[PDB]
Amino acid sequence: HWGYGKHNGPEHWHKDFPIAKGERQSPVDIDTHTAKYDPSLKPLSVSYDQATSLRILNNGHAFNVEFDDSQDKAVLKGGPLDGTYRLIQFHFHWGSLDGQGSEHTVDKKKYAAELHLVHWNTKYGDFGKAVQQPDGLAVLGIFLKVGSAKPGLQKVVDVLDSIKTKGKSADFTNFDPRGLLPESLDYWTYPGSLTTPPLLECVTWIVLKEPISVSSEQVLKFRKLNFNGEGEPEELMVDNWRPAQPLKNRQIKASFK
Numbered sequence: 001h002w003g004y005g006k007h008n009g010p011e012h013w014h015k016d017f018p019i020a021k022g023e024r025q026s027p028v029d030i031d032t033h034t035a036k037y038d039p040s041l042k043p044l045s046v047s048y049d050q051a052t053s054l055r056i057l058n059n060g061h062a063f064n065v066e067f068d069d070s071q072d073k074a075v076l077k078g079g080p081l082d083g084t085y086r087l088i089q090f091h092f093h094w095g096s097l098d099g100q101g102s103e104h105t106v107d108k109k110k111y112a113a114e115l116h117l118v119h120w121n122t123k124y125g126d127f128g129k130a131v132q133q134p135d136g137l138a139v140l141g142i143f144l145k146v147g148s149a150k151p152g153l154q155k156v157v158d159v160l161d162s163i164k165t166k167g168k169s170a171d172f173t174n175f176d177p178r179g180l181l182p183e184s185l186d187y188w189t190y191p192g193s194l195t196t197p198p199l200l201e202c203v204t205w206i207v208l209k210e211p212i213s214v215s216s217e218q219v220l221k222f223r224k225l226n227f228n229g230e231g232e233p234e235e236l237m238v239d240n241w242r243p244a245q246p247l248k249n250r251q252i253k254a255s256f257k
């Protein structure tokens with residue numbers, strides 16, 4: 001009923017999910033000429049040393065690398081956040097062409113892809129309760145450009161053939177998400193939403209300023225995934241991004257001058 005196809009893409013989502021036209025929808029364009037430095041912010045605290053990855057799953061829309069979130073193992077704190085947010089999963093959005101694929105844009109520039117590290121606020125006890133709260137989630141967004149290979153992404157690339165089609169999963173233990181980060185943790189932040197249905201307005205977005213680079217071969221392997229299930233007509237999993245939504249009555253704040 002929803003996807004990224006010719007007849008069920010983002011422009012249709014509002015019919016089943018009216019909040020698609022809401023006040024706090026994501027992604028947005030980040031205008032670097034109007035986002036204002038905020039001294040009230042802190043540095044991010046990203047604590048992934050004890051992360052326990054479990055599995056990788058093709059959900060028909062993207063693939064999720066899932067983590068054990070039953071203890072404080074991989075957490076995000078600081079920045080704009082109060083309290084402790086636990087990593088549940090990460091996934092990507094990417095294009096069919098190197099000049100599109102990201103959800104956020106920067107001065108209207110689209111990146112080749114965007115990584116979302118999804119975390120939920122432990123005060124709400126589980127993910128499903130968290131998404132019902134305005135401060136339920138914190139998503140760390142990281143842009144990808146094509147250039148040099150990202151070594152810490154290669155284990156993901158090499159498992160993709162095992163999860164080509166919707167509903168496939170594979171063991172994915174002992175993956176270190178620190179290998180997906182850029183050098184700098186400078187960021188922009190604003191209040192927004194999930195970027196897929198149900199489009200809930202439960203997210204504190206933290207979008208890193210510095211992109212990571214991935215190789216053309218790495219991206220090409222992402223583009224071989226399938227939206228479809230096994231034994232169905234092949235539909236390449238590409239262009240699984242929602243475009244920028246109106247900022248409305250929001251301000252984007254920068255952690256950096």
Ligand SMILES: [Cu+2]
Pocket residue numbers: 001002
């Ligand atoms: Cu459907």
Ligand SMILES: [Cu+2]
Pocket residue numbers: 091092093116195
């Ligand atoms: Cu996402």
